[PDB]
Amino acid sequence: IANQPVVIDNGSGVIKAGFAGDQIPKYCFPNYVGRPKHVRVMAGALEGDIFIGPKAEEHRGLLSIRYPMEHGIVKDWNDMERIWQYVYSKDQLQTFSEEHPVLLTEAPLNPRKNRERAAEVFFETFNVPALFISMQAVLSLYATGRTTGVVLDSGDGVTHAVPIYEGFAMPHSIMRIDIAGRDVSRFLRLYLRKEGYDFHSSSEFEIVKAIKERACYLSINPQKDETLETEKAQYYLPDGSTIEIGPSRFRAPELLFRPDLIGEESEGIHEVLVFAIQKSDMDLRRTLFSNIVLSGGSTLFKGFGDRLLSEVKKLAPKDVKIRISAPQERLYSTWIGGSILASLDTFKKMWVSKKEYEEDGARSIHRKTF
C-alpha cells in the first residue's frame, strides 16, 4: 500500500495540512479549540457545538477557545481527536488513515507519552498502514537544500535553534527551547492592563495576536531605542477602536532574549545557539556561522533578522562570517519540506508498520527514530 502520503504539519502555533507533492499546504489553521461561550436556545446555530474550522474562523467571541498544546505539547488529546476527525471533514479530506500512508512530525525532547499516545490514536482509532513521527528541522533542510545548518523554529510557545549536519546524531549539541509568542502576546495583554486596556478573553487574545503579528516591529538597538519617545501608533481596531501602542510593540519580543522581563532565567535562543556552537567543533562551527535557518511562523517580525543578527554580532567571536539563510514563508516551508520527505520514497525504512507498533510501540519509536 502506497497511496498519497499524508503531510501532517504538527503546527503548535498554526497547524497545517495536505498531502505530498502539493506545493501549498491545503488546510492551514491554528491551535484553537472552541465550543460556544454562550448557550444557543433557538435553532440557528451550527451543529456539532465544538467548533474548529471555518465556524471558529468566523465566530471568535462566540466560542470558548482553548489550547491543549502547553508549549506545543497537547494535554487534551480529546481536542486532537476531534481535530483529526475534522481532518477528514467534508470540507477537508473525506478519506481514511487506512487509505493512506501517513507522516507525522515532532519537536524533539517531548515526553514519550505524547508521541506514544498520538500513535495509539493513529493505529487504534485511525489505522495507518505505515507511519513515522519525524522531526521538524529536517523539513527546513529540504526547503534550503542544505544538510549542514542551524535551524531556528517558531511555534507559539516554542522557539529554538537546531544545529544540524547531514542528519547526524548530535542531540547534545542539538537544542530545544519551549518559549515563544504565546506569553509574549499574554505579556501584551499585561501591557493592556498596564495602561487600562481591558482585555482578557481568548478570542480577544486572538485579536490581540492578530494586531501583534500586524503592529509589532523589532528595533535593533535594545535600550537605545527602548528609551526613546514613542509615537504610540493608534491602531484602529477591526471594530474601529483607536488603540495606541508605545514602545511595547518591540518591548515584548525582547523578552524572547530578555527572559528576566517575565522573570524567566534563560539566555536568549541566540546564546543557546552559541552554546550549541560551543558544543560543536571549530571546523563545524564555521559551517554553522555560514549555515543558519530561521523558521516557524512566529519569527515574522519587522526589523527581525537584522536586530538578531546584530545581537549575534554583539556576542559573536572575532569577525566570523555569520550567515542566516531564510525561507520567505517560514510557515509554508516547514509543511513543504514535510511534503518533500513524504514524497521521498526512501521512507520505507523510516516508516513504522501498524503491526510493528502493535508489537513494540515505544521500542519501535526509538529504534526507528534512532
Ligand X SMILES: Nc1ncnc2c1ncn2[C@@H]1O[C@H](COP(=O)(O)OP(=O)(O)O)[C@@H](O)[C@H]1O
* Residue 226 interacts with another protein (CB under 8 A): yes or no: no
Residue 65 CB partners (closer than 8 Å, separation 6+):
32, 33, 34, 56, 202, 203, 205, 206
- The region, left, alpha or beta by phi > 0 then psi within -120 to 50, assigned to residue 87 is alpha
- Vertex 134 angle, CA 128 and 139, to 5°: 120
- Judge whether 158 and 178 are in contact, CB under 8 Å: yes
Candidates 172-180, 202-210, 293-301, 352-360; binding stretch for another protein (CB under 8 A): 293-301
The closest alpha carbon to 5, from 359, 348, 319, belongs to 348
Dihedrals φ, ψ of 117, to 5°?
-60, -45
Residues forming the site for ligand X (CB under 6 A)? 9, 11-14, 153-156, 158, 180-181, 209, 212-213, 296-298, 300-301, 330-331, 334
**Which C-beta is closer to another protein: that of 29 or that of 199?**
29
Among 34, 247, 253, 327, binds another protein (CB under 8 A): 327
Partner in contact with 306, chosen from another protein, its own copies, ligand X, none, beta carbon below 5 to 8 Å by kind:
another protein
Binding mask 14-43 for another protein (x = CB under 8 A): x--------xx---x---------------
**Which C-beta is closer to its own copies: that of 74 or that of 93?**
74
Among 223, 314, 319, 348, binds its own copies (CB under 8 A): 319
**Which C-beta is closer to its own copies: that of 1 or that of 39?**
39
C-alpha cell at 312: 549575534
Dihedrals φ, ψ of 264, to 5°?
-70, 145
Q: At what angle do helices 304-315 and 269-279 cross, to 10 degrees?
A: 50
Candidates 75-83, 155-163, 241-249, 299-307; binding stretch for another protein (CB under 8 A): 299-307
To 10 degrees, the CA torsion angle through 295, 301, 305, 309? -110
* Residue 187 interacts with another protein (CB under 8 A): yes or no: no
The length of the chain, given as a count of residues: 370
Partner in contact with 262, chosen from another protein, ligand X, its own copies, none, beta carbon below 5 to 8 Å by kind:
its own copies
Which helix (H) or strand (E) segment holds residue 257: the answer is none
Smallest gap from residue 183 Cβ to ligand X (A)? 11
**Which C-beta is closer to ligand X: that of 36 or that of 108?**
108
Binding mask 148-187 for its own copies (x = CB under 8 A): x---------------xxxxxxx-xx--x-x---------
- Match 560543536 to its residue by C-alpha cell: 280
Among 59, 267, 322, 360, binds another protein (CB under 8 A): 322
Q: Judging by DSSP bridges, how do beta strands 148-152 and 292-294 pair with one another?
A: parallel
Partner in contact with 298, chosen from another protein, ligand X, its own copies, none, beta carbon below 5 to 8 Å by kind:
ligand X
Residues in region 132-161 near another protein by CB under 8 A: 142-145
Binding mask 205-234 for its own copies (x = CB under 8 A): --x---------------------------
Contacts 24+ apart (CB under 8 A), 288-291: 288/148, 288/149, 288/150, 288/163, 289/316, 289/320, 289/321, 289/322, 289/323, 290/321, 290/323, 291/146, 291/148, 291/149, 291/150, 291/323, 291/325
Using Cβ positions, the residue closest to ligand X within the complex turns out to be 11
The closest alpha carbon to 152, from 131, 132, 166, 137, belongs to 137
Q: Give me the residues that bind another protein (CB under 8 A), please.
A: 14, 23-24, 28, 142-145, 294, 297, 300-306, 309, 313, 320-329, 331-333, 336-337, 339-340, 343-346
